[PDB]
Amino acid sequence: VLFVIARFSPYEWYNPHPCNPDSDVVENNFTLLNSFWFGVGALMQQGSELMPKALSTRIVGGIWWFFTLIIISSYTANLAAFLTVERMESPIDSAD
Amino acid sequence: VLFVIARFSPYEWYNPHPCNPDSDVVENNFTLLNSFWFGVGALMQQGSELMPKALSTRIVGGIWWFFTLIIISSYTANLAAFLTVERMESPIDSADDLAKQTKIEYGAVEDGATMTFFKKSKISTYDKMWAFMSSRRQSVLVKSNEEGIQRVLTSDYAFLMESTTIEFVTQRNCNLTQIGGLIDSKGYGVGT
Amino acid sequence: DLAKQTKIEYGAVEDGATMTFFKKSKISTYDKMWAFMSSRRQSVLVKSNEEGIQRVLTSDYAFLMESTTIEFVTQRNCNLTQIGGLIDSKGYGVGTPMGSPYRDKITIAILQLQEEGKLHMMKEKWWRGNGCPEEESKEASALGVQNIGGIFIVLAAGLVLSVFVAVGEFLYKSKKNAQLEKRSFCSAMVEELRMSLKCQRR
Amino acid sequence: FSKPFMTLGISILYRKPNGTNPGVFSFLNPLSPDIWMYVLLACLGVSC
Ligand SMILES: CCCCCCCC/C=C/CCCCCCCC(=O)O[C@@H](COC(=O)CCCCCCCCCCCCCCC)COP(=O)([O-])OCC[N+](C)(C)C
Ligand SMILES: CCCCCCCC/C=C/CCCCCCCC(=O)O[C@@H](COC(=O)CCCCCCCCCCCCCCC)COP(=O)([O-])OCC[N+](C)(C)C
Ligand SMILES: CCCCCCCC/C=C/CCCCCCCC(=O)O[C@@H](COC(=O)CCCCCCCCCCCCCCC)COP(=O)([O-])OCC[N+](C)(C)C
Ligand SMILES: CCCCCCCC/C=C\CCCCCCCC(=O)O[C@@H](COC(=O)CCCCCCCCCCCCCCC)COP(=O)([O-])OCC[N+](C)(C)C
Ligand SMILES: CCCCCCCC/C=C\CCCCCCCC(=O)O[C@@H](COC(=O)CCCCCCCCCCCCCCC)COP(=O)([O-])OCC[N+](C)(C)C
Ligand SMILES: CCCCCCCC/C=C\CCCCCCCC(=O)O[C@@H](COC(=O)CCCCCCCCCCCCCCC)COP(=O)([O-])OCC[N+](C)(C)C
Ligand SMILES: *[C@@H]1O[C@H](CO)[C@@H](O[C@@H]2O[C@H](CO)[C@@H](O)[C@H](O)[C@H]2NC(C)=O)[C@H](O)[C@H]1NC(C)=O
Numbered sequence: 353v354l355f356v357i358a359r360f361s362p363y364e365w366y367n368p369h370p371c372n373p374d375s376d377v378v379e380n381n382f383t384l385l386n387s388f389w390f391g392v393g394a395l396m397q398q399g400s401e402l403m404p405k406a407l408s409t410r411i412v413g414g415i416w417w418f419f420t421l422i423i424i425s426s427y428t429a430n431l432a433a434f435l436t437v438e439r440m441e442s443p444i445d446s447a448d
Numbered sequence: 449v450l451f452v453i454a455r456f457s458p459y460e461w462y463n464p465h466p467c468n469p470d471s472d473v474v475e476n477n478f479t480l481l482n483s484f485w486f487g488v489g490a491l492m493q494q495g496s497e498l499m500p501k502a503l504s505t506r507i508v509g510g511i512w513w514f515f516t517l518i519i520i521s522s523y524t525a526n527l528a529a530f531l532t533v534e535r536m537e538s539p540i541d542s543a544d545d546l547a548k549q550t551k552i553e554y555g556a557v558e559d560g561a562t563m564t565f566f567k568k569s570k571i572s573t574y575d576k577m578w579a580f581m582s583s584r585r586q587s588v589l590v591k592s593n594e595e596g597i598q599r600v601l602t603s604d605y606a607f608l609m610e611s612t613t614i615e616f617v618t619q620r621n622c623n624l625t626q627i628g629g630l631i632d633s634k635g636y637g638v639g640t
Numbered sequence: 641d642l643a644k645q646t647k648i649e650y651g652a653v654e655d656g657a658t659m660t661f662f663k664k665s666k667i668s669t670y671d672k673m674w675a676f677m678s679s680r681r682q683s684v685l686v687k688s689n690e691e692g693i694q695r696v697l698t699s700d701y702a703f704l705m706e707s708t709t710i711e712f713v714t715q716r717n718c719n720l721t722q723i724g725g726l727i728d729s730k731g732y733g734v735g736t737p738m739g740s741p742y743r744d745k746i747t748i749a750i751l752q753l754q755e756e757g758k759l760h761m762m763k764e765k766w767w768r769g770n771g772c773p774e775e776e777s778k779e780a781s782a783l784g785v786q787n788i789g790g791i792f793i794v795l796a797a798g799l800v801l802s803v804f805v806a807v808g809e810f811l812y813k814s815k816k817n818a819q820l821e822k823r824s825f826c827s828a829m830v831e832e833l834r835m836s837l838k839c840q841r842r
Numbered sequence: 843f844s845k846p847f848m849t850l851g852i853s854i855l856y857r858k859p860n861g862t863n864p865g866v867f868s869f870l871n872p873l874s875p876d877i878w879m880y881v882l883l884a885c886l887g888v889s890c
């Protein structure tokens with residue numbers, strides 16, 4: 353979805369070129385291979401070097417960060433229960 | 449307030465201009481669209497391409513990070529507790545809910561005290577139940593307790609019975625419970 | 641738990657059923673309580689219910705009493721509750737002398753009132769008091785403002801502390817450039833024209 | 843006696859223990875107040 357919007361949004365078209373372009377070197381650095389890397393790079397909590405610039409891609413960056421914030425937090429909170437393995441509790445303990 | 453300071457701080461105005469700085473360049477990267485992106489970007493723990501300069505904006509970045517450090521850390525603490533499912537609340541909870549419906553059939557043991565209770569009741573809620581039970585008297589009034597327990601299992605049926613006999617059944621079948629409080633109070637007495 | 645301790649004194653109303661209950665009890669737990677109560681009989685056995693309620697408030701004291709009178713007190717004082725389940729089961733009965741024509745007539749008359757619900761209507765009339773704000777209702781404990789709270793305080797105080805650094809960054813710049821370019825108070829207002837510009841500039 | 847008009851039971855009357863609230867600086871509790879200094883003297887130290 354981010355690759356669809358990045359080519360479609362006319363603000364992600366920027367020129368890299370920190371020094372006096374004077375005509376046209378405008379690029380759209382989100383390829384396919386960069387778009388998965390922003391997705392995987394935010395899923396593993398590390399964060400990529402590539403950041404969205406147009407607002408059309410910020411909400412995609414915004415919701416996906418909130419998505420991976422809940423996935424990883426629900427992963428950590430549940431895995432505390434599964435490493436602390438509740439032991440064998442065969443349901444006879446006394447004469448009662 | 450990050451955008452207000454970054455358009456007021458006379459050190460945020462930096463030149464990109466990497467080669468050799470001449471004149472007439474400098475510009476803030478904190479537009480008002482950008483300052484939400486530092487605010488959301490720090491809140492979502494992922495970090496932005498934006499990083500402030502100019503100590504007055506560093507302190508806003510300093511205190512917002514310690515803000516979002518605690519909120520995310522507090523959110524992960526209780527999150528182990530709230531990921532437990534809750535089973536569905538029963539559509540009846542008292543005699544008022546069970547009288548004001550026709551989806552669940554309900555009766556009691558015929559020629560018993562509970563049938564005798566609603567027959568001679570003058571409570572407006574409880575008279576509705578005997579107005580219900582007297583019509584389809586062949587269907588909802590079972591002959592014994594054991595036929596009453598079985599038709600709760602094998603159908604959609606709520607059964608009116610004594611509290612102490614519920615105390616034996618619910619300790620035996622854990623899929624089937626007491627609904628609501630005690631309607632009246634009575635007692636088993638040795639008859640003479 | 642209450643029998644196996646000496647930190648909390650405990651008794652009941654003297655010349656009552658609860659004193660009579662533990663006196664003629666043969667339960668091993670309950671005989672320990674009457675072994676306790678008979679020794680310091682002057683201290684822990686109060687004379688009435690009202691003296692028993694007051695010494696729970698004004699001291700470290702657990703009081704043995706009826707369930708229904710607890711139901712009136714705990715709806716009135718929300719700092720003081722019932723501990724544990726019912727020890728026994730008893731009943732308030734209208735006493736008559738030994739052989740009377742009024743025992744059976746009231747036995748009819750009490751049973752008539754409870755099927756009409758009037759024994760329940762009278763109990764709700766008196767035992768329902770202030771409603772008594774009840775309990776935390778122990779469950780998962782979703783964070784309100786009362787237990788996070790201060791992270792908004794340091795965030796508010798952090799932004800207050802930040803803007804005095806921003807005028808501190810302003811004045812240290814406005815003193816530095818005015819050494820040679822312009823004067824002291826005016827060149828601050830010159831940069832106010834810079835900052836209030838809605839555009840990009842030099 | 844007649845036949846009862848109210849059901850009883852002997853029970854224990856006792857004070858509720860006070861539920862002292864986790865006051866709004868509650869998140870500083872998981873570390874000791876000298877460790878918060880020791881982290882602060884670390885980030886003032888290691889940065890130097
Ligand atoms: C949750 C949502 C709540 C609402 C969100 C918050 C509110 C929404 C915020 C809306 C405005 C903020 C968006 C970024 C700027 C807009 C640029 C643009 O539209 O294209 C412009 C490109 O020209 C420029 O880019 C000039 C850059 C201006 C400085 C950028 C920050 C100042 C915005 C300050 C914002 C107010 C702060 C107080 C005033 C200082 C086209 O120019 P124009 O269209 O013809 O405009 C007049 C030309 N002029 C400006 C160049 C003279
Ligand atoms: C990992 C980050 C570390 C950073 C290093 C710095 C750490 C230096 C910290 C050092 C110690 C600070 C906490 C004191 C110790 C707590 C124990 C205590 O007794 O206090 C208690 C008194 O309440 C207070 O007085 C708390 C201190 C108020 C200032 C808090 C500043 C936040 C830290 C600024 C950092 C932001 C900037 C960070 C950088 C941009 C609090 O407990 P209570 O709730 O009041 O209980 C009583 C409630 N009751 C009365 C109702 C019962
Ligand atoms: C190179 C090595 C260093 C050299 C040595 C230098 C010498 C240093 C030696 C230091 C020795 C230690 C002395 C202090 C001991 C305090 C512990 C304590 O018990 O008191 C209290 C601390 O609670 C507070 O009130 C803390 C003060 C506010 C917290 C904010 C401070 C940091 C702010 C952000 C930092 C920005 C970071 C920026 C990073 C760039 C806790 O108890 P209390 O119940 O709360 O008491 C209330 C007291 N009161 C009533 C007055 C409120
Ligand atoms: C957004 C455009 C409109 C889309 C609408 C269509 C899309 C739908 C597509 C698929 C879903 C189809 C199935 C459900 C359909 C109904 C939805 C629903 O469930 O209702 C929910 C409410 O809905 C909400 O309020 C949540 C909406 C979140 C808004 C996110 C905005 C983020 C922008 C900020 C970005 C910041 C960026 C940062 C950078 C600056 C609740 O309903 P329920 O609990 O499920 O009801 C159960 C009732 N029952 C209990 C009896 C059983
Ligand atoms: C960690 C910091 C992250 C900040 C994010 C904060 C986001 C906004 C936060 C909160 C906003 C809404 C709060 C109400 C939720 C209560 C539960 C509920 O009602 O569920 C009910 C239905 O579901 C709903 O009715 C909620 C519909 C909106 C859901 C989507 C909100 C997230 C926005 C998406 C944007 C993502 C982020 C945007 C930026 C990218 C289920 O029924 P119930 O539970 O039985 O009813 C109890 C109702 N009660 C509890 C109210 C009494
Ligand atoms: C921009 C928007 C501004 C508008 C909003 C401004 C409003 C804020 C006004 C004033 C804020 C500043 C003073 C705090 C007093 C707040 C009042 C209060 O609640 O009482 C406080 C007492 O006082 C304390 O305990 C605070 C101790 C210091 C913490 C605050 C500064 C952090 C120190 C590090 C510096 C960080 C910066 C540097 C970091 C690098 C809390 O105790 P309480 O009374 O028991 O609480 C009542 C709750 N109750 C009723 C449930 C009992
Ligand atoms: C709840 O009960 C009392 C009420 O405050 C607290 O203990 C007494 O507190 C008063 C002052 O309010 C002192 O004069 C007494 O000496 C205290 N008595 C005892 C035995 O401590 C008590 O601390 C409160 N909190 C809890 C958790 O019980």
Ligand SMILES: CC(C)CCC[C@@H](C)[C@H]1CC[C@H]2[C@@H]3CC=C4C[C@@H](O)CC[C@]4(C)[C@H]3CC[C@]12C
Nearest residue numbers: 785786789790791792793794795796797799866
């Ligand atoms: C930081 C700014 C920019 C946004 C947040 C506003 C802050 C200052 C406001 C919003 C909600 C407020 C809280 C709302 C409720 C309570 C409970 C009360 O018993 C004490 C005050 C306290 C704890 C308030 C403190 C101040 C508070 C945290």
Ligand SMILES: CC(C)CCC[C@@H](C)[C@H]1CC[C@H]2[C@@H]3CC=C4C[C@@H](O)CC[C@]4(C)[C@H]3CC[C@]12C
Nearest residue numbers: 459501502503504804805806807808809810812
């Ligand atoms: C409250 C005040 C008085 C105390 C803090 C002083 C502040 C406002 C001033 C005093 C000297 C200033 C520094 C002087 C020079 C530089 C080098 C420049 O390349 C980046 C900004 C920087 C690093 C300034 C940041 C702000 C600064 C630290």
Ligand SMILES: CC(C)CCC[C@@H](C)[C@H]1CC[C@H]2[C@@H]3CC=C4C[C@@H](O)CC[C@]4(C)[C@H]3CC[C@]12C
Nearest residue numbers: 876879880881882883884885886887888889890
């Ligand atoms: C790099 C610097 C600035 C960090 C802060 C100072 C360090 C070196 C000091 C401050 C207080 C010190 C601690 C104080 C108390 C103890 C307990 C003792 O049984 C073992 C050493 C130990 C654990 C010390 C280790 C070193 C310590 C943590």
Ligand SMILES: O=S1(=O)NCN(C2CC2)c2ccc(F)cc21
Nearest residue numbers: 633634635754759845846847848
């Ligand atoms: O049917 S009874 O003999 N008389 C009426 N009552 C009650 C008023 C509660 C009670 C309460 C408990 C019983 F065991 C018996 C009866």
Ligand SMILES: N[C@@H](CCC(=O)O)C(=O)O
Nearest residue numbers: 557560561562608609610
């Ligand atoms: N046990 C009741 C009959 C069953 C019932 O009414 O629930 C009685 O003594 O009459």
Ligand SMILES: N[C@@H](CCC(=O)O)C(=O)O
Nearest residue numbers: 653656657658659705706
């Ligand atoms: N209510 C009791 C007396 C008080 C008590 O023994 O707790 C009774 O009727 O004898």
